Structures are given as C-alpha cells and as structure tokens.
Design a protein around this ligand. Structure first.
Ligand SMILES: [Cl-]
Ligand SMILES: [Cl-]
Ligand SMILES: [Cl-]
Ligand SMILES: [Cl-]
Ligand SMILES: [Cl-]
Ligand SMILES: [Cl-]
Ligand SMILES: [Cl-]
Ligand code: NA
Ligand code: NA
Lengths: 840, 844
C-alpha cells in the first residue's frame, strides 16, 4: 500500500526559525468619487479613499486623479496622493481609548490610523477621529482641489472623555454630531459652539445606577447585528414656528440597560489588575429596553444654536410596537418626510419596516397638561405605517437593502426596493408599492394596537431577481440605484456561490441581468453616484488582490448594456511567492445529495503513493463561508506553512455555512454542533477517497471560536476520526453566549434544553480522551466576545471528570491574536503539538 | 544503575492517587482545639473540671462546641478516653452548601481555615456565656456559672437584629456580659444580649451607592493587616466600667482603629461564582504604594441600671494620630491594661525596623466635633500630665517580627512605673522573655498648642530589664503561641525551641527570681499546648515524623511549696494517635554543615523497597521563604501525603530548610534581606548534593524542583540560575514580580522598589524569562484562578514574558481555587498531573 509520510522533527528554536522565515498593507477602501467640472483640465474625477501604501505605517486619507483619456496599449497605475501632511492619526503605541479599542474589536479593524471618515460632497468637508480627538479638512467645492497634503484642523471641545461616532449634518455642513458620555451632542465646526441634545446620562458616581444612553448601539447590536450607530440625521431642514428659525432633526435610539446582566472582563493594562464592566445579555436574559426618539435643535442666520428639544413617540414605543425586541436599522426618506426603522421580534422570525412621520413625536415633558395638549394636537391622519413584513419558520437575517423612491405630491403610496430572503429562501430584490392610508387616531386616548394595526396594503410586489443564488445585502454589501435610467446595481452569487460579482437589472422592466465584473475572480465593488465609473477590489485562489477602475461606456440610449471598460489600476496583484501554493477547491455530494465545497492544501513537493498527516481546519458556523474563489495567502498563510512541512490541510463548508440560501444554513436550527461534524467527517472521507494522500489515522481538528467548539465536538463524538483537537477560544456552554446570536440559531435555553445540552461541549467532558496529549485549548485572556469563562468552565469540568488537557493563554489578546510575537508563538506551539502528538 | 519509575496510563495514575488518599489510614482535622478549663463547684461530685473545645467528632461533618468532664481521680495503669459531649442539640452551624458570605469566605482564607462549622467562640467564664457565628447569624448559649452545668445538648438562641448584612467579629463585653460588640457595614455596633437593643457607635461608613467613594471603616483589620500581620480585629474592649457621668450612668469603652483606604490602589479578583463572570474589588497596597491612613479612636457609651444604651460618643486623639506619631505606618497590635487605666498599641514604621509599645490614657481622647470652639475648649481641658508613654522600643538593621507577648502587671494607685513581660528578638537576635520596668513621668503638655514631636518624645526611662530566658533558641511568640502567667506563684509558662529547633516544648521559669527553666513536655515529639487559667492542668497536641498526632490532658502535681517543679502527670486522652499507616514510610531528618559552616536541617523520603547500587529520579520539594520551617519532628503525612506517594513510585524526595527559614533566629532568616531568590537556591543545591553524597541513591541527572507560592518562585529561580542541576521545574502559584506583591511582606524583606531596584530586578523571575529553557517539557506552571494573595496576574505576566521571549511552557489552572487547592477532585487532578509530568519528562 501507500507509505506513511513522516514530517521532519525540529527543535523548538528550529520551529521558531520556520515560522519567523515564513512571515518574511491595506488596499484602497471607503471610496468617494467626485466629478471635476472644468473642461480644460485632464481629469474627470478625484477618487478619495483610505489606504496604507507600502512606505506608510498607518491607514490615512488619500486621493487619485482619474484621467479623461487613457492609452489603449498601456496600463495606467494611478499615483496615491496624501491628503494629510506628516500627520500621525494613530495615538501613542497604537493604544486607543477603551471606547475606540472596543469599536475596533466589534468592526474587526486591525490596521492603525484613520479607519473611517464622514464626507459632505457639496462643501468638500471630511470629518474623522484621529490622535484621541476629532479633526477635519476640506477639499473640492468652493476652496478647490489641493495638489499637496494639508494639515488637518483639530476641533476643540470642553467635553470630558471621547467624542465618538462623528457625523456631518447633511442639510447644513456647519454642524456635526457626536456621542459623549452616552449622550448625543451637536457642534458648529465654524464657530466652535457645542450643545448637548440628550440628557439620559445623569453622570452619577456609581455607573450601575446610570443605565440610560442616547444615540448608542449597545453590545449585542454592535457584535450580532452589525450596527455601530444609534442615531440618524434627518437629511433636510424644516422651518416650524413664526420666528423663521431653521430646525435640524436627529432620530436616535434611547436604551435603558438597568435589567441587563453585568459581567467583568480583564482590561488590557494587565499591571493595573482591573476589569471593565459590560452589559452582556446572555441568552434567555433581558436585552436593553429601547425606544426611538427625535432630537431637534434650532439655528439662526449666524449659525447660533438657539434651542434644543427631546421628542418622544406620542404613545410609548412598547405600546405602539409591543413585540419589538431589537431595532436592526433606521434612517430617513430622502425628503425627510418619514423616519423609518427595521424592527425584529425576540425569536428573530418576524421583521417589520415602519415609517414614522416626525409629527408622531411630541416634546418630552414632566408637565402632564403640556404632554396631553401636545398628544391632542397630533393630526388624526398621522400614524406609523408598516410598509413591509417578513416572517419565517427559520430566522430573519438582517439585510441592509431598503431604498424608498421619492413620492409625488398628493400620492398616498410608497414605492421601494427591498432585499427579501424569507419569500423564496434566497435573498432577492423586489420592487414593492405600499398604500399609505390614514385610519384616523385620537393620539390623546391610549390604546393597545396589535401587530396588524398600522399594516399597509401591498399594491404591487415585483421580483427583480430570482433563482437558487443570492443578492448580497450584509456586511458592507449594498445596491446603487440610477433613477434616471431605472437601473439597480447589486452584488450577487448568480454565476457561482464561490465568487461575488457586480450585476445590473432594470427596476422598471425587470428582465435581463448583466454581469459587470470579470468571471474567475471574487469582486468587492464601489460605484460612483453618477454611474459613470466603479472600482473593483478582486482576487482569486491563485492571484493576490488588485484594485481596478472601470468606466461605464457606450450609447446613453442603451444604459443596461454599458461596457465596464478597464480604465486604470490603483493596485496590481503582488507576485505569488514561490513557496506559496494555492489550495485547490473541490465539491462533492453528501449521502443526502447536498453539494458541499471544500479546499485542500496539498503537501508541498507531493510524491505519489504516500499518505500524509492531515489538519482539518474548521470554522463551520453560520454567517461564514471559508471556501470561495478569493486569495487566502494573506489571512491563512499558516495553512500554506503546514502544507510546506508535509501536512495536508482540509477545509469543508458544511451545512450551516452562508451564501447557499436559508434552507442550507437552516440545517443547524436548534441543534448546533450536530450536522456540522457529520459534514466535516463526510468531507474528510471524500478528500481521502478522491486525492489518496490523506492518512486518516493522523487527522487533527483545529479551529477558533465556533471552530474551537467544533474541534471539541469532533473529539467528543468522533474520537476514532480525530487523533487530536486544538480548540481556540471555544464556545463550551451556549447558555453563556449572547441573546442576539444564540437565540437566533438555538432559541432560549428554556425552549431548547435538549439542543443547549447536546451543543455544550463542557457538559460532555466524560467523552473527552482519558489519554494525554489529544487536546490543546487556547484562549485570549481579554476576550470580551467568547469570554475566557468558556475555557475556565471547560477546565473546571475536565478536572471534575479526571481528564488531562494542555492549555495556552494569550494574556494580552482579546478574541483574535493581533500581536505578531503572540501570532508566531501560537504557530510554533501548533507545529510542536502536531510534530509530537499527531505522529504515532 | 539508573532506576526507571514504572510508566502508568493516565487512568492508572488516577487509581494510584485515589487509592493513596481513600486508604491513607489518616483523617484530616480530627483534633479538638480552642480549650477552656472551668473548675466544677461540687465537693461530692466526681469531676474537677468541665473542658470546653471545638471539634469534629467521628459521626459529624462539621466543627461544633463540645465538652468533656475531667475526673477527680484516674486509675494509674489505665488509659481514660474522655467522652466528647455535644453542647448543641442537632444544630447545623455551616451555611447551605458550605457557601459563606464573601466577608466570612475571605476571613477563612486569611486565617487558613478549611474546616466547616463553628471555627471560633467568645467565652465569659463568670457568666458562662458563649457567643459565636453560625448559619449566617449570631448565636449564644450559657453553661456553668449561675445556670448550672448541662447534662444533655441544648438549642443555641439566635440573636435577632435589625442590621442589614453580616455581623462580623462578635465579642462579649468583659466588664458587663449583658453587652457584646460586632462590625456591621464597616462600623462598630454594640447590643444588649438580654434586651435585644442595638446601637451604632461609629459613623465612618456613609453607605454611598459607589463603595469607592466610601473609603473609611472603624473596628476592621484591612487586607495587609490580616494577610501579613496576623491581626483579624480592629477593636478592643476596655476591660473595666467607669462612673464619671453625673446621672448614675455606667461608661463602657472600646478602642478601635479607624482607616481611610481612599489612596489605596484598587484591584479586581474573580469571584468564586464563576457563572456570574464578576470580580470583587480589593484595596490591595502593592509594594511602594500607599497603605491605608490609620488612627486609634475611642468609642464610649453609657448604660442605665436597666441595661438601656442611653448615649454614645466618638472620641479622637487631642492632636491628630499623624502629628503625635508621624513615623507610624502600621498598628501591629493593641489592647488595654487589665485595670483599663491605659489603652496600648504596638506601632511599626514603614521600613519595619522600628517598633514602639505606647500607652494612651483615655483622657488623651476628646469628643469628635465640627465645632472649632468646642474642640479648642476640649483640647484646653486635657490635663497637662496626660500624654502617650513609649514604654518600650525595638530597633534592628534586619526587620521587626511582630511578637504577640506583652503582659502588663496592674499598677498600684499613685505608682509612676509600669512592670510588664515582653518577648523581644531584636535585643540578642533570638526571641526571649524580659521583665521590664518603665518610669511614667510627665513634664507637661499644652494639648491646645500645635504639636511637633522631638526625637525620643514620650520615651520612658527603663529602671530594670531582667532576661527571663536566653540562648541560641527562641520563645515562640507568633501564630497562636502565647505565655500563661500565674501571679500567685510568680511563674510564666511558655513554648520554645530550647531542647532543639526540631520540636516545640512547654517550659516554665520564675519572673520573680529568674533562674532554672523546667521542661513540662516529653522529648521526641513537637507539642502545641493549652494551659488552664488555674495552672492545675494543660493539654498537649503532639506528634513526631513517625507518629500521627494525639491530644492528651496532663495534671500538674506535687507540693504547693515548690511550684516550679510541679510534675506533669498523664491524666486522660482527648484523641489517641492513629497507627502509622503501613504503606506510609516516615521521612528521615538529617543535618549538614554548608561550606560557610551553617547547620541546615533536611528530610529525605527514601524510594520505597530501595535496592543497592540504584540511582533514583529525585524531587526537591521547596518552600524556602521567611516565616516557615518545613523540617521539624512533627507528623507530615496529613499535609504532605503526596511526598510518600512519590517515594512509593521510586522517586527520592528531598526537603532542605535553607537560610531565610524560621525557628533559627533573626541572623539566620536575615541572610535573604534585600536579595530574595539568591541565598535560597545555593542552600537547596548544597543540600541536594549533600544527600547525593551521604545516601548514594540520588540520580543528579534527574532532579525536579517543585513548590507552591515562595516555593513556586524558587522552582523558577532554580531552573533560571541552575539549569544543569534541575531537569524540570513545577512552579505552583509563583511570585514572578515582587513589584506586584503587597507592602507588609515585600517591604519587610526587600525595602520599596525605588530603594532596592537591583534586588527587585534580580528576584523577579518574570524579568529573566530569556534564561528559562528553549526546550519544551521542562516547565509546568500551576495557579488557582481566584488567588487573592498571589494574584493569577503573576502567572499571566510570566506567560506574557515567555511569549515575548519565544519560550515553551505548560500550564494548568484551578478555576475554582484561591491560593490553596481545597476541593478533593482538584487536589487529585494536581497529583495525577504531577505524576504524569515526572514520568514523561523527568525520565530520559
Ligand atoms: Cl464593545
Ligand atoms: Cl488512511
Ligand atoms: Cl469515531
Ligand atoms: Cl474516555
Ligand atoms: Cl519531661
Ligand atoms: Cl536558554
Ligand atoms: Cl485536596
Ligand atoms: Na446565506
Ligand atoms: Na525566627
């Protein structure tokens, strides 16, 4: 038969040398296209973005000039121009305030420097956080275009502590907003006047007695709903009152975390031996009490803030919308006529999109007579409108795509584009027309509306897309709508679940879908609001990422068939290193006839007739797809390093993984751990049969977070398949994880005792090996996501069951290893564990 | 020539450890303790005494209040086993599931209490009142005195309260047992046990929502005082009543320490309810940082003839504590003279090289007030001849060990001197008893004038100082050791190491005509003794390396004209020794002289069934820090059974008491001053090499070093400084950075960081990780996650440094353990882990 390949044994310092030698940049992102309006000049656009070029040590604000003409037989590489002159945005040592540090963790930001900016195109104002403060600069508009970097200007404050989530006022760019000490503020950038708008935070010495915030996304909203803001500027000014003062409006979420459980997580300054306190809603326990409110302020001709007002719903949020647990998203119609919100129930099986006219909000007051007078003055024809409802027996994934069209005068309907997955089980674009008919309400007379009370008739609902593929509507994916040509641009998996592509379809006469991106790569695209050009950041399994600029070209009478003409490069693909070998993608059909995709890192310098020790690298949880046609060598270089030593590395996207529709991910509903391990084992056995170089007697299972959970599930349920498990930051008891994630997939513990018990690996330690050196646990001590508690509880159970274990801690790490020295130590530790204990 | 230990499966090692403990032949904490002898008052009856104590009898799961009857006569050639009687009828003292309040749990950690149930009681002999904590509350019962002696167990009576939260540190008022005191929410309270009336005396704690804005306490010993000075109370009853009110009222007095922890650094340690994922906050003074601000104050209250608490007063020193005593960092001890004429305190400076014993008359304390006019009136009224008296001062270039022995003789009226007994170590370098006479004369102070004390302010002339004991041995004066003084016979009973540093013995000497010292305990055992307050009998709790502990009652017998030569006569047993278990082989004690000619003691556990010409893998078991002696002639099998288990598998186990260890005088422990880590490893290696040469069965190529706390520190120091000597180290709860340990301990032995940068740097193993092995499987770190003494931070920081230096390590954590492993499942897992690590990695 086949010989068994033996990986070379190295000393510990030899393994350090291999890892250090193996490790012998952020592409342009967050694009703004600005048209240049001068016929004589050679540039059509300035393109603004964030990037870290090769010579730089941080992410900063950059621009490139897009030429009117390019040579056909020559590749233009655009110069990256610095907006900021010798400006360090990173604070000392890359040590952020706790507020900025935790936001960077929630957003998975690793790069130092400016990681976001707000831009007002008409004025050319840029507003961003830098150096523990707020800075601005101006380019374009009336001031003209810079040709060398400028010093940004610090915005002075009398506020104590961080100014978070800064945004420019759309209607009047003299104003911006920020959060300070859990309240919403505004300031005039020109005069330096600041004004507090909300008064939720009392500033009590005992923070636990001070549980309200305004304008803030709480922990579960940031970690599990991908929402990082709790306030939304009205895009328009209004002129109520006889004095002729200008009113500016902000919709905001007020939260009360009083009933939310408090946990303590060690702080990164280890020598201080202290914790930070978190309102951490564990599954089955209380989420924050929430409401939408309206903050208003008035300004005079000189830009002086004359007055401020908190307004609340004329009847309480909890009375109007009694089954709402979460606000997923909110915003405004472009005319400011309606605020809107996306509401979820606690089971996350029911979503409503609701219009809220500003007239439904009345001034907050302690005076009962004034409050009742305000309520009585709300016009009878003012109400919430539920313009869309999504219901499922699986779960609602929050999709970010909701595009309301402008209404005509006297028109009692709203037309909108909506991404909807629950209708067919695949996320698709629909054009929806809702009828807005006033029932007539006496808002001074309290009532208990049911769920259907404010429901709008649907006049029309047109599928713009259909089939067994997805429109991408999550984690930064969006649509772009050209109302002149009646085209919607979107990203999707129509060509293959392995590649993201840009497409265009008519929303007027839904028919042909045109693909605008190059097949054989996975694309991340940014479209000009003038629909004249777009950027694609793309890669393949074999080819490092590039960033290319395309001009949409051809007859204006045929907009659907505009050519994406390659125009210029912002970044050419790095050379594939000679010691990097891309993984190979495969697919197979399970015994139940489900198609699964996988990847295999073949042992380097592979010889026929030899079976190699194998690492099954697993994530396996919802909302992630590990296997796709994109470059893996930046994020997963360590898997190439394993293959270079003679390990085979296998990755399987089993049922529960994403980009395959709701029914595919729905397989794990209420039974997390169970179908995932069956698919991992079927995949491993398929790879062994097809490729013939897998030694099934020497398989390690390794993953982080959900992957750490499945590594332990593998050793517990399939101890004859998996010789060793290496479990990083594992979930070991689902009852210790949060509401937003755990309840979506598993229900509350009281409703799914069997599934919680079967899925909690710390309750099955009696099934873990009674042999030493089969189990290595790794965990960041500062982890605020999968708490170090999960590992501590697992260890407590291992001691009680009389089981051996190996443990490594990363004292200075949260949920991921960010420090290069700790990353190398982790990789050396893994190589050592495999060389000693995966071998017989 | 090289012995190989038999390799076992993990489950094989579990079976060996489980069998070793289940079938140990020994039982933990079976010894009765906290003895009170009461004479019986019936001439016809068969008993001379009732003996009260705490114990856990064979058919019980907890410590309760017990008694035994001491008979008037015993048969000479017959062994009386005293019947243990329950005082309390079917009473569970342990709270539900053995889960104590955070306050009681941490006090049990500071006191090293493992047993469940009643762990202490206060007793008032004249009334026969017992006062104790049980079941998250306060209970009492009465026996003897006016009530009579019970013949069967009684129900204890709960003391009702309207207080919120625990009533801690309860004490009976000595002058009037109708009254008792307790601490509630960091303030001093008193109550009438007969009427149920309660009264708050101190108003330090505001009860603010933010506890960090509420930093004052009264009557409480803070963290460093409990952990490093062995003091668990911050208040002291005046033993006498006074009648100075013009209304027929009786005044009772309590001296108390007020603390302000405002400037003390706050740290967070995880709570034992792991599932709550929370921490408790500690005012933890790290070395070099602020200790609490302290003052002695006086609480007074008046009672009427009905026992009603009529009025209370907080009084403070007429000049601030900080003005009168500007070099005082710590109050080590306090109390009163037996007549109540003076409060006294033992004061330490921050370097802990200067101790003062100071008398404070109650007239030096005036009413606390915000009214400046009333304060000045009070200060002007303090008599000119009222002052502090420094009656004794101890100064050293090493450090002051706090000795608990201070016995003031009551003064005569108009006598301007104080005679007292005092244990003093700094005078000769050995702890000895002195009879001292100080002269108490005032030249006068205007206490209304601002005060700046000179050198020798308040210092008393010493008229006489008689050494009652002397030599190169110690009177035991710490950690429970005390003297007993018979003022009728002029004899002082004490414990010491006069016969050998390997055994504690009971002795007696005259304080009148200091001369012959008589030994009352049997040589060849180490004794822990309790003397009757009538000096007619004593209890000895004793053992040897070969014989498990017993508890015996002795009668002191012979002519009343020759009290110094009263003979100890065996009377009865409270607990016979278990047999030495047959698979337990006692260690052998040896001594050797270092190359510097210092005598060191050690012990060896020989490999079981030793064959000649065989060299065995060896475990050096190490503590090596101050205040501990591992090597003495007492039974080690209850605490150190695991060392017998290692020897039964064929490991040699070596223990060395190196320089820095205790019971050898101040110079011997003083060798590690400002250089912790340095001399300790040299002595461990000299001992290991001595044992290898003398016994011939030590394989010096296969030596593991293992210890806990200071021993974990030295295990790492061994692997860093002597990597050719120590093949592997197992470091439990190690101190890895001295800058993270506390003021009381670290500054005593090492000074502050800013004064000893070189010593702190050299002694902090986490700053020398580049010297730890670049080979895997030579270092195992173990730590309790909940450790509030040696914080888990020490291990976390060591790991952080190991990662930065690219070093391998193995780690085990005990998520549910503080500084010691208390859970049997965790103890077994620890022992299995150690056996597996030695079998795989100490072998080639
Ligand atoms: Cl966060
Ligand atoms: Cl095979
Ligand atoms: Cl199996
Ligand atoms: Cl098993
Ligand atoms: Cl004797
Ligand atoms: Cl080395
Ligand atoms: Cl134990
Ligand atoms: Na999906
Ligand atoms: Na000593």
């Amino acid at each position: 038969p086949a010989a068994r390949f033996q990986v070379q044994k190295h000393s510990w310092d030899g393994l350090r040398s291999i890892i250090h030698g193996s490790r012998k940049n952020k592409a342009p992102h967050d694009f703004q296209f600005v048209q240049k309006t001068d016929e004589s000049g050679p540039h059509s656009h300035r393109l603004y973005y964030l990037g870290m070029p090769y010579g730089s040590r941080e992410n900063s604000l950059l621009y490139s000039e897009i030429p009117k003409k390019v040579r056909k037989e020559a590749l233009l590489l655009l110069s990256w121009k610095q907006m900021l002159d010798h400006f360090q945005a990173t604070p000392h040592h890359g040590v952020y305030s706790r507020e900025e540090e935790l936001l960077r963790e929630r957003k998975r930001l690793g790069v130092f420097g400016i990681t976001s900016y707000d831009f007002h195109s008409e004025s050319g104002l840029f507003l961003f956080q830098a150096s523990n403060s707020l800075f601005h600069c101006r380019d374009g508009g009336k001031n003209g275009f810079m040709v060398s970097p400028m010093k940004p200007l610090e915005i002075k404050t009398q506020c104590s502590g961080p100014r978070m989530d800064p945004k420019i006022c759309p209607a009047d760019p003299a104003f911006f907003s920020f959060i300070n000490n859990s309240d919403l503020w505004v300031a005039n950038i020109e005069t330096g006047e600041e004004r507090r708008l909300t008064f939720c935070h009392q500033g009590l010495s005992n923070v636990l007695d001070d549980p309200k915030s305004a304008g803030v996304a709480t922990f579960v909203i940031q970690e599990e709903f991908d929402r990082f803001t709790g306030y939304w500027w009205c895009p328009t000014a209004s002129w109520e009152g006889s004095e002729g003062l200008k009113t500016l409006r902000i919709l905001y979420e007020e939260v009360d975390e009083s009933e939310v459980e408090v946990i303590h997580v060690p702080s990164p300054a280890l020598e201080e031996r202290k914790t930070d306190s978190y309102r951490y809603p564990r599954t089955g326990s209380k989420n924050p009490k929430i409401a939408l409110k309206l903050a208003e302020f008035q300004t005079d001709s000189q830009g002086k803030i004359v007055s401020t007002q908190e307004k609340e719903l004329v009847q309480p949020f909890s009375s109007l919308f009694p089954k709402v647990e979460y606000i997923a998203r909110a915003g405004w119609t472009r005319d400011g006529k309606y605020a809107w919100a996306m509401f979820l129930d606690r089971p996350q099986q029911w979503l409503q999109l609701v219009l809220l006219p500003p007239a439904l909000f009345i001034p907050s007051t302690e005076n009962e007579e004034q409050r009742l007078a305000s309520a009585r003055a709300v016009p009878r024809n003012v109400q919430p409108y539920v313009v869309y409802e999504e219901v499922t027996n699986v779960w609602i994934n929050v999709h970010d795509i909701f595009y309301p069209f402008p209404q005509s005068e006297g028109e009692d309907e709203l037309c909108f584009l909506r991404a909807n997955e629950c209708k067919t089980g695949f996320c698709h674009l629909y054009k929806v027309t809702a009828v807005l008919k006033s029932q007539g309400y006496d808002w001074s007379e309290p009532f208990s509306p049911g769920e259907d009370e404010f429901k709008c008739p649907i006049k029309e609902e047109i599928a713009l897309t259909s089939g067994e593929w997805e429109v991408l509507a999550r984690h930064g994916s969006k649509i772009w709508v050209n109302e002149e040509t009646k085209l919607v641009y979107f990203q999707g998996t129509k060509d293959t679940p392995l590649e993201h592509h840009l497409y265009v379809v008519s929303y007027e006469a839904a028919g042909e879908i045109v693909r605008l991106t190059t097949p054989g790569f996975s694309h991340s695209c940014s479209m000009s609001q003038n629909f004249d050009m777009f950027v694609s950041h793309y890669s393949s399994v074999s080819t490092p990422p590039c960033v290319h600029v395309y001009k949409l070209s051809g007859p204006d009478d045929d907009p659907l068939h505009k050519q994406p003409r390659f125009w210029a490069s912002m970044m050419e693909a790095a050379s594939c290193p000679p010691d990097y070998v891309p993984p190979e993608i495969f697919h197979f059909h399970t015994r139940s006839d489900v198609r699964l995709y996988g990847m295999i890192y073949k042992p380097h310098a592979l010889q026929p007739g030899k079976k190699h020790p194998t690492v099954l690298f697993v994530y396996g949880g919802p909302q992630v797809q590990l296997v796709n046609n994109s470059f893996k060598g930046i994020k997963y270089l360590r898997l190439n390093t394993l293959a270079s030593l003679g390990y085979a590395v296998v990755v399987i996207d089993g049922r529960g993984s994403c980009q395959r529709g709701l029914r595919f991910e729905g397989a794990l509903k209420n039974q997390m751990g169970q179908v995932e391990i069956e698919d991992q084992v079927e995949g491993l056995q398929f790879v062994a049969e097809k490729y013939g170089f897998i030694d099934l007697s020497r398989v390690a299972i390794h993953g982080w977070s959900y992957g750490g959970f499945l590594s332990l599930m593998g050793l517990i349920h399939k101890p004859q398949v998996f010789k060793v498990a290496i479990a990083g930051a594992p979930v070991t008891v689902w009852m210790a994880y949060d509401t937003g994630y755990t309840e979506r997939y598993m229900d509350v513990p009281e409703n799914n005792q069997h599934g919680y018990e079967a899925g909690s690996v710390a309750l099955h330690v009696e099934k873990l090996p009674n042999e030493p050196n089969r189990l290595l646990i790794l965990h960041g001590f500062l982890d605020e996501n999968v708490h170090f508690f999960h590992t501590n509880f697992l260890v407590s159970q291992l001691i009680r069951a009389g089981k051996p274990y190996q443990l490594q801690i990363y004292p200075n790490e949260r949920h991921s290893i960010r420090c290069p020295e700790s990353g190398e130590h982790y990789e050396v530790t893994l190589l050592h564990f495999l060389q000693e204990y995966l071998h017989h």
